[PDB]
Design an enzyme around this catalytic site. Structure first.
Site, PDB file in Angstrom:
ATOM      1  N   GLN A 188      -3.993   2.838 -14.912  1.00 19.54           N
ATOM      2  CA  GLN A 188      -3.159   3.806 -14.212  1.00 19.54           C
ATOM      3  C   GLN A 188      -2.320   3.202 -13.087  1.00 19.54           C
ATOM      4  OE1 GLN A 188      -2.602   6.907 -15.034  1.00 19.54           O
ATOM      5  NE2 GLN A 188      -3.984   6.806 -16.802  1.00 19.54           N
TER       6      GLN A 188
ATOM      7  N   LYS B 287       0.220   3.614 -22.432  1.00 20.32           N
ATOM      8  CA  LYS B 287       0.459   4.341 -21.181  1.00 20.32           C
ATOM      9  C   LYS B 287       1.665   3.862 -20.413  1.00 20.32           C
ATOM     10  CE  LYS B 287      -4.134   5.895 -20.479  1.00 20.32           C
ATOM     11  NZ  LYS B 287      -5.269   5.262 -19.830  1.00 20.32           N
TER      12      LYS B 287
ATOM     13  N   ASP C 298      -9.783  -2.281 -13.639  1.00 20.99           N
ATOM     14  CA  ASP C 298      -9.284  -1.378 -14.648  1.00 20.99           C
ATOM     15  C   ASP C 298      -7.944  -0.862 -14.131  1.00 20.99           C
ATOM     16  OD1 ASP C 298      -8.628   0.693 -16.296  1.00 20.99           O
ATOM     17  OD2 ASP C 298     -10.507   1.801 -16.026  1.00 20.99           O
TER      18      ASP C 298
ATOM     19  N   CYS D  81     -12.414  11.534 -20.055  1.00 19.75           N
ATOM     20  CA  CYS D  81     -13.261  10.341 -20.154  1.00 19.75           C
ATOM     21  C   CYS D  81     -13.870   9.980 -18.830  1.00 19.75           C
ATOM     22  CB  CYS D  81     -12.548   9.065 -20.595  1.00 19.75           C
ATOM     23  SG  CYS D  81     -11.393   9.347 -21.884  1.00 19.75           S
TER      24      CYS D  81
ATOM     25  N   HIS E 203     -13.795   5.506 -15.633  1.00 23.27           N
ATOM     26  CA  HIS E 203     -13.497   5.899 -17.006  1.00 23.27           C
ATOM     27  C   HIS E 203     -14.643   5.434 -17.916  1.00 23.27           C
ATOM     28  CE1 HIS E 203     -11.320   5.833 -20.879  1.00 23.27           C
ATOM     29  NE2 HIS E 203     -10.437   6.643 -20.319  1.00 23.27           N
TER      30      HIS E 203
END
Lengths: 413, 413
Positions: B202, B225, B199, B368, B122
């Site tokens: 998700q 999210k 990261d 992104c 990202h």
């Protein structure tokens, strides 16, 4: 029916008892309370059109983007920015000052360059500029107070020289309640090529602010002090300056193109808004602006002048009270707050007893202005601060409760 | 009654028509929707106990502080951090990555030092490390994809060397839906003295995440999210690591003492939390954690595996559709999203028509992840992304609408 008595209904939080007593909230300088209109806006966003903004295409995303960008325009119009693109969204005024310090400061300040602050500066206006100073070799020049406990403006003036590159000072002090003549200051600063950053956290919620009239280069404020949600604030900056400034935070949304080896950057304000913003909170800040605008900022300010004077007069009539800062008069303005101490008593004891026995909410500490309290010879002060949902009735209750509290601690002596 | 059909009632936003059609929201990877429990928490905060936090004394301030710090503990528990003081509140995961880049990166990276990322990163990973590289002389090493369109783990491991200082990679890809073997990668990195930043944007919303199991040094996620409000996210960092790092943003609350000439700083997490935080939003994030925990992250993950697979199968059954990333298997698990393109058609046309004619919300663009798209040979893809409030019925409606949309554009050919 006074302004406070007319609007109190809008603020659900005021209508409760704490520790057995009717709440009297006198801590608006720490944070403000929210009218139903703002909370409604926030709930409507999440319930009906939450979606990520920009590039989105679909109905909800389009609406969310439209409202987010309209909120930026609302803030622009509130402070009379010429262009909505001069408004950058941050978490708070603190982050906004840091943005200036990193992006503008690190790229413009050289060894020997001078930055002027006052000894009454809030920590968020001091610490970032100390850090820049340590990194660039720039030097901080502090303006001390006069006998009326206001930054010595004569002592600000002759501090300005061709070596001055920035003045960074409050519009209104969060402790002294005094103002600075920003418009004049900006003229003196521009005369030597220096920029001016205005810490407007205590003016934006409380009086008309016109950034074009001030001609300030940067201006900062937080939503949570002006009837808006926590989690958002803004940086105003002249377009030409923003355009000259490199990115602070990097990532999504602030780029134009990203390649493995390098990225190119969007123009302001997008350049400075990295990743998914506080969308709902921005929209609710817009609602806060509409709410304040509906009442009218001249009306709010005139009302605050009156209750502020009332608080000052009644507080100062109690023996053993010292209120820090200037005396109110025809010429000298005070915000609607008083920071004070009572002889032989610790302000934390005052605040604790006030809350526990009387349900009165004030604050005790250095209020993020430790050097100021140092200069005045104390470690802490008590602070009662008002907003337009307060009334003379609230002041009266405070004064009665404070008198009782002082009586209580003095009884053991 | 499937999980989606049981929880849909909680999400007010899903029960509306857009453009004459029942909304089908398939854009949760851009942002998630919020259950009433979360919105209630937010409203209850503002209506009943909003006040600034820390140093506060009075009843509302104590309560706000208690709830704000309890929310930090809820987050720490959610990801199995060993200490709530290892959680730092930011605006979003993007800012959390920037915090690491500035505080840790600038103070630890020297010329020649290498940082490993994948081509599927990202932008909020890629850009901050690019900027760090430009300032420190550090060098970025990118991991390419294999034949199954997943970052090549062999090439990743081979890139790890004595020159490797940081590996910054996704737990789960927001485009490919593939995951990386983080726990294993951490072992290889620690063996050469490198740190790993995960990261986890998700993964945190969708599956059990255990930072002690992973043993990662840093981990980032965004509230928006995972059923929480916009405006807040977090950095997890090992306590020892956080203690070694210098302040990023400066100002109020992050200090211990402020003097005119210098400041001393608080310990983590306070050290990294400058000025008034997103108090209400943190509290609502805690409510989001409670809500997800009440359903159960294992139940959610199992459900997503089922509907993700269903979406993959139905989508891949349509002629001329190419889905990016790996094929589902018992070895290979995908998150519940598909990024795809249809032969000869522009994904922006698909997304626009799906929304306007079918009320179906998907996203078109590079999500992104522009270098990933460039790698794959396109400028953009369409992406349908699910969460646990979606159903097989939603997937069915999407597939019917997509086939119609394809039919429409191909009719002019």
């Amino acid at each position: 029916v006074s302004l406070g008595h007319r609007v109190r209904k809008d603020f659900r939080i005021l209508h409760q008892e704490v520790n057995g007593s009717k709440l009297v909230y006198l801590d608006s300088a720490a944070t403000s309370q929210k009218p139903a209109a703002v909370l409604d806006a926030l709930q409507n966003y999440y319930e009906f059109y939450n979606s990520n903004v920009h590039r989105g295409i679909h109905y909800l995303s389009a609406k969310a983007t439209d409202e987010f960008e309209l909120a930026r325009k609302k803030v622009a119009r509130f402070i009379n920015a010429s262009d909505s693109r001069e408004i950058v969204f941050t978490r708070n005024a603190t982050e906004a000052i840091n943005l200036v310090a990193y992006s503008w400061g690190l790229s413009n300040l050289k060894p020997g360059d001078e930055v002027i602050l006052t000894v009454a500066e809030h920590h968020s206006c001091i610490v970032p500029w100390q850090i820049v100073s340590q990194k660039t070799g720039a030097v901080l020049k502090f303006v001390t107070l006069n006998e009326d406990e206001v930054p010595d403006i004569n002592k600000l003036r002759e501090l300005i020289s061709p070596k001055t590159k920035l003045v960074a000072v409050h519009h209104v002090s969060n402790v002294l309640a005094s103002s600075l003549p920003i418009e004049e200051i900006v003229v003196w600063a521009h005369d030597v090529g220096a920029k001016v950053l205005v810490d407007a956290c205590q003016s934006v919620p409380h009086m008309v602010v016109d950034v074009q009239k001030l001609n300030a280069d940067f201006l900062v404020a937080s939503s949570h002090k002006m009837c808006g949600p926590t989690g958002i604030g803004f940086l105003y900056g002249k377009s030409d300056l923003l355009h000259s400034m490199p990115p602070f935070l990097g990532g999504g949304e602030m780029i134009s193109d990203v390649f493995l080896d390098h990225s190119t950057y969007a123009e302001p304000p997008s350049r400075f808004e990295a990743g998914t913003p506080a969308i709902g909170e921005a929209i609710a800040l817009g609602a806060a602006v509409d709410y304040l605008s509906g009442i009218g900022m001249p009306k709010i300010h005139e009302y605050e002048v009156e209750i502020g004077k009332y608080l000052y007069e009644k507080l100062s009539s109690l023996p053993d009270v010292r209120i820090y800062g200037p005396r109110p008069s025809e010429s000298v303005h005070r915000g609607a707050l008083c920071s004070f101490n009572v002889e032989g008593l610790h302000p934390t004891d005052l605040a604790t007893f006030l809350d526990q026995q009387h349900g009165v909410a004030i604050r005790s500490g250095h209020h993020c202005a430790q050097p100021l309290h140092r200069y005045l010879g104390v470690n802490a002060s008590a602070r009662a601060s008002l907003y337009f949902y307060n009334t003379k009735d609230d002041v009266d209750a405070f004064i009665v409760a404070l008198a009782d509290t002082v009586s209580f601690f003095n009884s053991f002596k």
